[PDB]
Ligand binder design. Structure first.
Ligand SMILES: *[C@@H]1O[C@H](CO)[C@@H](O[C@@H]2O[C@H](CO)[C@@H](O)[C@H](O)[C@H]2NC(C)=O)[C@H](O)[C@H]1NC(C)=O
Ligand code: NAG
Lengths: 286, 363, 42, 49, 50
């Protein structure tokens, strides 16, 4: 076994905020203006050898629909509409590019790795960690000259109850915790929200103790080896330290939820009601 | 001789034996011939010779065996400390039950077992991906939304129609590529425009997220340990299942005694040497390799072809350790044990690890 | 090595020429309309 | 029509006819789709420098 | 048509992927680049005589 640090999982599905996000309002309003710009431009070119129809054509070709039968009648109107559509492609293209970018560098945080993660040269206030009061692991702390500084910071919020450090990370007050492995690798597999850090710290293993040179000192160790030769400890472990047999993780692609996507459905309902608000309008105008 | 743990080297033609930081190893080995031996066990022996009294010189073996027993005549490594021709022996020597009976052991210092080696097969970017990029929320959201906006379109048209309308509106989402007809009426057109502006962003967001799932690629053929079906069924699943070992090994006696049920299948797969195996793997001549990870770990962080990695480590055949031989019923053991324990008590083990145990692909 | 940007939003200066080429096409359209008003003699 | 085809072919148009040249247009369209896709693919990288 | 969309979509995704992991090689960094613990035959390097 060895020494290792406990952390809480991330609950990754927390990335997206809205859908108007990748632009900025400026560009929105600007393109909204420019579409009317080229609309009236086309119409004025049309009067000098269809107005609302032409506006429909233009303000539509953005949204890929096919509503409207219009067309350019002149030569210059045609020579304009082409590059109009060329521009149109670029917008949605760039939109795809940006929204893709927001999901590739969407890396929330790297999980802390071992003692030598220099975040634990001297820590901040957004990352608490300690040992249990008077836990023998501190013995390798003071007996090794380096971690003295950490020892001061480790002494900050030492949770004195070993059975309460699990709660300490379970309450999000603590996030990481230094301890031995062979209990942690069991503790992570209760619910998969509690994870290890994978880096082994101090190589040693347990054993059996007898008073000095029992008649059974050189005897039972032969069994404990031979017993460990076939399958015993492995099966016993799988029956005692493999509860729920959970897998570790990936850098999740973070599939989107309705809970952060549905913003467009507000606009859907808004267009729904704008229908009835416009219904009597055109009838009365006729 | 060894894996990298103990490297021999010839003599320098200018200065005779050879350079510093290396103990000589010469003897009347074959017919006296010389060499000098540098490596991990070398430094361990030196640090031991520091704190305790002096040592003798070195010696290499003729019987070639890493410690095999035959006809009660243990041949090879241990076979030379039963006749007490050598007071003890060192080097990468395993620890079993058979070897434990004759001579004694030190306290072990490096954990070890028997593990699996295979090339990292590319093998998969995704088993199923199309549905991954979305929660079930948005799909039923879209369905109810279309199912109601179709009705709103019909019933804004009150001031050919119904079926064709739903047809068009469905087709709109997926690229709206299908040719259709019948939009009309300057009152509801704007609603359709709204739905289209929704559809375009929908598609774009979809393909955006889907452009990420192909950038996880946590590919693994997690074939479990020696209780596996492919092992249990060496020919029931594919022709080219071909394991590989090197007999005259402690691992060999162990695997035989425990799994004769497939050990007979293995005898057709005995190579010569150790790196012959890795070569045969890099050619795909052999499917999977099995041996003590005590050397597989090191060999991993040695090759540029970083595909040569293990299946889930630690979960290996049996947890044992490397030690140091000693003649039976002597007195040194009591001191030597405390010595290596104090060595652990200085952390210098991690230091000698960083000396030569690291690998490029340890990331 | 330098870590990467966190996918900032987009803003005008980034999309610099995407409106300038538009206005250039608009001016080209103007000169073509001039050419049209001119060709009434041929 | 053929110009408009490339950039999403979104603009409403008319007048394809004749069962001899239609296949040519099909060819050009299959070219256009891969063209657009490749374009936006590469462009999906420049934002990652 | 639903199926039809998926094809071109996946095509975009894959072709994008082929251009993001398109990292030819990392330039060697300092002495301690462990490629120069013991080198291969595809990377030669030395000093001038004496
Ligand atoms: C295991 O060791 C034996 C003995 O060294 C190897 O066998 C021999 O090959 C030599 C070469 O001529 C013969 O003289 C011996 O008679 C052979 N021994 C036996 C028992 O036949 C054997 O090849 C080794 N095998 C492995 C896998 O290491
Ligand atoms: C992975 O890459 C190697 C290197 O080209 C290739 O030979 C192999 O076919 C790929 N796939 C698998 C499953 O190994």
């Amino acid at each position: 076994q060895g020494l290792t640090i406990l952390v809480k999982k991330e609950i990754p599905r927390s990335t997206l905020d809205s859908f108007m996000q990748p632009f900025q309002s400026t560009l929105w309003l600007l393109v909204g203006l420019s579409v009317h710009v080229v609309a009236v431009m086309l119409y004025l070119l049309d009067r000098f050898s269809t107005l609302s129809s032409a506006m429909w054509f233009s303000w539509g070709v953005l949204l890929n629909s096919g509503i409207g039968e219009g067309a350019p009648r002149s030569f210059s109107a045609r020579i304009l509409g082409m590059v109009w559509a060329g521009f149109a492609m670029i917008i949605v293209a760039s939109y795809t590019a940006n929204l893709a970018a927001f999901l590739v560098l969407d890396r929330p945080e790297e999980r802390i790795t071992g003692i030598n993660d220099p975040r634990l040269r001297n820590p901040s206030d957004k990352f608490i960690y300690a040992t249990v009061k008077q836990s023998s692991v501190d013995i390798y702390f003071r007996r090794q000259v380096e971690l003295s500084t950490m020892y001061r910071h480790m002494e900050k919020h030492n949770y004195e109850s070993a059975a309460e450090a699990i709660q300490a990370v379970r309450d999000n007050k603590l996030h990481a915790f230094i301890w031995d492995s062979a209990v942690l690798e069991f503790e992570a597999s209760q619910k998969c929200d509690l994870v290890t850090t994978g880096e082994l710290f101090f190589r040693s293993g347990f054993g059996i103790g007898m008073r000095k040179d029992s008649p059974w000192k050189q005897q039972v160790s032969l069994s404990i080896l031979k017993s460990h030769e076939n399958g015993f400890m492995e099966d016993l472990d799988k029956t005692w330290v493999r509860y729920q047999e959970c897998d570790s993780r990936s850098n999740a692609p973070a599939t989107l939820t309705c809970e952060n996507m549905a913003g467009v459905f507000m606009l859907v309902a808004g267009g729904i009601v704008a229908g009835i608000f416009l219904i009597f309008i055109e009838i009365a105008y006729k | 001789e060894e894996a990298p743990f103990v490297i021999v080297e010839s003599v320098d033609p200018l200065s005779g034996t050879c350079m510093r930081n290396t103990v000589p190893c010469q003897k009347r080995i074959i017919s006296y011939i010389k060499k000098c031996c540098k490596g991990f066990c070398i430094d361990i022996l030196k640090k031991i010779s520091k704190s305790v009294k002096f040592t003798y010189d070195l010696y290499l073996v003729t019987n070639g065996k890493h410690g095999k027993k035959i006809n009660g005549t243990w041949n090879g490594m241990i076979g030379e400390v039963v006749m007490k021709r050598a007071y003890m022996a060192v080097g990468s020597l395993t620890i079993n039950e058979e070897r434990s009976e004759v001579v004694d052991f030190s306290v072990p210092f490096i954990e070890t077992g028997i593990s699996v080696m295979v090339s990292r097969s590319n093998g998969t970017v995704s088993p199923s991906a199309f549905l991954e990029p979305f929660s079930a929320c948005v799909w039923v959201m879209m369905f109810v939304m279309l199912l109601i906006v179709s009705a709103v379109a019909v019933f804004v048209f009150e001031y050919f129609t119904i079926g064709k309308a739903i047809w068009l509106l469905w087709g709109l989402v997926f690229n709206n590529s299908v040719p259709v007809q019948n939009p009309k009426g300057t009152t509801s057109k704007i609603m359709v425009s709204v739905w289209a502006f929704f559809a375009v962003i929908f598609l774009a967001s979809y393909t955006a997220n889907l452009a990420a799932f192909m950038i996880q690629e946590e590919y693994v053929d997690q074939v479990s340990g020696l209780s596996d079906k492919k092992f249990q069924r060496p020919n029931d699943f594919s022709p080219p299942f071909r394991f590989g070992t090197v007999p005259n090994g402690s691992t060999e006696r162990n695997i035989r005694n425990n799994y004769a049920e497939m050990h007979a299948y293995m005898g057709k797969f005995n190579q010569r040497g150790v790196d012959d195996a890795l070569l045969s793997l890099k050619t795909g001549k052999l499917d999977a390799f099995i041996y003590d990870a005590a050397v597989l770990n090191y060999m991993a962080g040695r090759d540029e072809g970083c595909k040569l990695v293990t299946i889930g480590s630690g979960k290996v055949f049996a947890s044992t350790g490397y030690g140091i031989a000693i003649q039976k019923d002597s007195g040194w053991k009591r001191q030597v044990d405390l010595a290596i324990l104090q060595l652990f008590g200085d952390g210098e083990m991690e230091e000698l690890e960083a000396l030569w145990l690291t690998g490029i692909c340890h990331n | 090595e330098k870590n990467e940007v966190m996918s900032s939003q987009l803003d005008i200066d980034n999309m610099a020429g995407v409106f300038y080429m538009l206005g250039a096409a608009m001016a080209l359209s103007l000169i073509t309309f001039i050419s049209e008003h001119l060709f009434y003699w041929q």
